[PDB]
Design a protein around this ligand. Structure first.
Ligand SMILES: C[S@@+](CC[C@H](N)C(=O)[O-])C[C@H]1O[C@@H](n2cnc3c(N)ncnc32)[C@H](O)[C@@H]1O
Length: 219
């Protein structure tokens, strides 16, 4: 017997993500990057983009800041595309592609000034372990922006209409992702870890987990 197989984040899936990233979703990346810059005022140092995929968020951040960026993704197929995209954009000097998993990040302790992630958290198995790793690699005084969304209401609404036409079931998955179910879920995850300082936000720009590493309250 034989089979032809399709699974998430494989070569075919990476191509689909890349195509959408370059077309329908393209405008969201500069907006999200701008939102991140404006929110925290971090414009240099080290930034880790977790679940970077075809690399569009990293590329947008590079174009608006002076960060040294590492784009971490567990899919070889995503990383092959991201490498090409980064090179095409003349950003090889700005963004390093790192093959690896959020559950065992190949980065030293206390390294990152900023950790960002779009559209990955909703897929992670073992989120407690993932968030312990995220906290481990975050520098004291560092910030995160981990979640999903479209940057602003106008883009959210226009893109959603098109996504629903293409992929009707996306409507319900997106509705589950960008909601209070995840605010509750992730509050509970961070609380089990014992994180002293965070915000989890939900609004027109999306759903985002914003951890601040600070000297802890229990001493
Ligand atoms: C929907 S894509 C989003 C891609 C990109 N961040 C963007 O917004 O265009 C989700 C990505 O997370 C990656 N991913 C999923 N689980 C992961 C894990 N445990 N560790 C690292 N990457 C992961 C996938 O391979 C995929 O590239």
């Amino acid at each position: 017997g034989m089979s032809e197989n399709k699974k998430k984040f494989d070569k075919k899936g990476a191509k689909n993500m890349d195509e959408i990233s370059k077309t329908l979703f393209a405008p969201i990346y500069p907006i999200i990057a701008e939102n991140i810059i404006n929110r925290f005022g971090i414009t240099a140092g080290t930034c880790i983009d977790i679940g970077s995929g075809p690399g569009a968020l990293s590329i947008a951040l590079a174009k608006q800041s002076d960060f040294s960026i590492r784009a971490l993704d567990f899919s070889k197929h995503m990383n092959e595309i991201a490498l090409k995209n980064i090179a095409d954009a003349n950003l090889n000097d700005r963004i390093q592609i790192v093959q690896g998993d959020v559950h065992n990040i190949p980065i030293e302790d206390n390294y990152a000034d900023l950790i960002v992630s779009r559209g990955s958290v909703f897929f992670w198995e073992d989120v407690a372990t993932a968030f312990r790793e995220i906290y481990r690699i975050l520098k004291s005084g560092g910030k995160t922006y981990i979640g999903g969304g479209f940057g602003n209401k106008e883009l959210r609404d226009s893109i959603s209409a098109e996504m629903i036409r293409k992929n009707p079931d996306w409507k319900e998955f997106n509705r589950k992702n960008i909601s209070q179910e995840n605010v509750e879920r992730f509050q509970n995850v961070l609380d089990e870890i014992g994180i002293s300082s965070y915000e989890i936000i939900l609004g027109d720009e999306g759903f985002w987990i914003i951890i601040s590493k600070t000297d802890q309250e229990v001493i």
